């Protein structure tokens, strides 16, 4: 199945995809707007799933439900393409990215044994409010889709997909966001991951990245070495009183791009403000007491599948970064030299906003896994990554 | 959801 090329994508049919409302690939879009109308009819009875398995909405307040996900997540979810790592979301992450303002219990759709209750498939949404273009739209975010490797390649990911279509429709919302690793019709944007190494001793001994055989060991730590405190004036973890601030540059810098969130005031606390081993968001306060950049990256530790008890892999992940008063070179050096301080092994970085603008200067290396965005029931024209301004768990 | 990437090797 998954294709992770466009030419190779190029190269095949897709049974399901075919069937929903997303153009097709290779089709060049020049207008704007839905592929369907909105639904004054909506199925109120949940898809079908195969003979033995059921539907559940997952109370992640109930912190037995809370475990189950994260095992499900920490043994089934995405790996990278040598099946190597794979992603270890932390429960206290998971509340965070599945509980945002406005979060609904009905839009944590699981799939369990009938005869054991035991969680094999996952799918998630939330609501986001999401410039696109010149349309604003009330949207969801759909992230966390999951099939235990038992049942896999038996069709119960597109069910996944109807069944909180169904449940979204239900709620009056008729567009979603999503991001993959593997091309579908039909990319509104291709971003690529690039990774700074912070700790390349032992990224090089879990094999995350390899010494380049003309590089010693010791030449490649001094490459990567960084100061030991940030350089910028005035930089300070975020705190409350940050909130309206954060608020406002974020909502005045995002409008250069064409895909972006639109984000409440609560909508911001709820995404900036630090909570420990989730997300960090660091402000610059300057010499007047005025807040006028942030920087900020979520933890995203990955399990080492060769070496199952060892440590994991330590990875920060850039989340927004503002600037308007200092340069976003230095503000991203001094994310480095955060992550860095905090024990991350890794930090990543898409290439969309203006990341491309500090990639190679601060030693990034190129990965080897693009992210592809996507839109469900709204076909517009595709953007480069620059121009992409939404970044998602 | 999200993927995983890791340095392009040469
Ligand atoms: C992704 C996953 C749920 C797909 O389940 P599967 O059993 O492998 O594939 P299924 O037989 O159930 O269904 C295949 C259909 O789902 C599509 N599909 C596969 N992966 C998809 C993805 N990440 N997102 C959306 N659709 C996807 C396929 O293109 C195919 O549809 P098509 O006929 O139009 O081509 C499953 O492989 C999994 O849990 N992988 C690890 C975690 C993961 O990658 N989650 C998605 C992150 S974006
Ligand atoms: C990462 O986990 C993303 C997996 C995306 C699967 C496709 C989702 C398609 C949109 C479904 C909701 C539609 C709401 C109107
Ligand atoms: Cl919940
Ligand atoms: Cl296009």
């Known amino acids: ?393 | 959801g999200n993927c995983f990437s890791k340095p392009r090797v040469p």
Request: net charge neutral; with cysteine.
């Open chain 1, 1 to 393: 199945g998954p294709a992770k090329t466009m030419e190779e994508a190029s190269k095949r049919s897709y049974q399901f995809w075919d069937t929903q409302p997303v153009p097709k690939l290779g089709e060049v879009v020049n207008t704007h707007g839905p592929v369907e109308p909105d639904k004054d009819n909506i199925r109120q009875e949940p898809y079908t799933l195969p003979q033995g398995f059921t539907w559940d909405a997952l109370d992640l307040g109930d912190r037995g439900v809370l475990k189950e996900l994260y095992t499900l997540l920490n043994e089934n979810y995405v790996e990278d393409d040598d099946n190597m790592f794979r992603f270890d979301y932390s429960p206290e992450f998971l509340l965070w990215a599945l509980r945002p303002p406005g979060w609904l219990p009905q839009w944590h759709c699981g799939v369990r044994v009938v005869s054991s209750r035991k969680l094999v498939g996952f799918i998630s949404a939330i609501p986001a409010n999401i410039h696109i273009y010149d349309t604003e739209k009330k949207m969801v975010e759909i992230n966390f889709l999951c099939v235990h490797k038992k049942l896999r390649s038996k069709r119960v990911a597109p069910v996944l997909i109807r069944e909180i279509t169904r449940r979204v429709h239900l709620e009056g919302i008729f567009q979603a966001v999503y991001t993959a690793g593997v091309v579908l019709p039909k990319p509104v944007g291709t971003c690529r991951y690039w990774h700074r190494s912070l700790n390349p001793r032992k990224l090089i001994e879990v094999k995350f990245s390899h010494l380049s055989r003309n590089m010693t060991m010791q030449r490649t730590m001094k490459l990567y070495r960084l100061p030991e405190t940030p350089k910028t004036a005035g930089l300070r973890p975020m705190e409350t009183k940050d909130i309206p601030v954060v608020h406002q540059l974020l909502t005045r810098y995002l409008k250069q791009f064409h895909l972006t969130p639109v984000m409440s005031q609560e909508e911001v606390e709820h995404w900036f403000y630090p909570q420990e081993n989730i997300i960090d968001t660091f402000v610059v306060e300057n010499a007047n007491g005025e807040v006028t950049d942030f920087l900020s990256f979520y933890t995203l530790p990955s399990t080492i599948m060769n070496h199952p008890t060892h440590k994991s892999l330590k990875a920060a992940y850039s989340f927004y970064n503002v600037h308007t008063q200092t340069p976003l070179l230095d503000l991203m050096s001094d994310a480095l030299v955060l992550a860095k301080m905090k024990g991350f092994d890794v930090f990543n970085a898409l290439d969309l906003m203006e990341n491309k603008t500090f990639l190679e200067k601060l030693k990034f290396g190129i990965g080897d896994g693009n992210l592809q965005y996507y839109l469900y029931n709204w076909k517009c024209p595709s953007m480069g990554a620059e121009k992409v301004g939404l970044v998602l768990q």
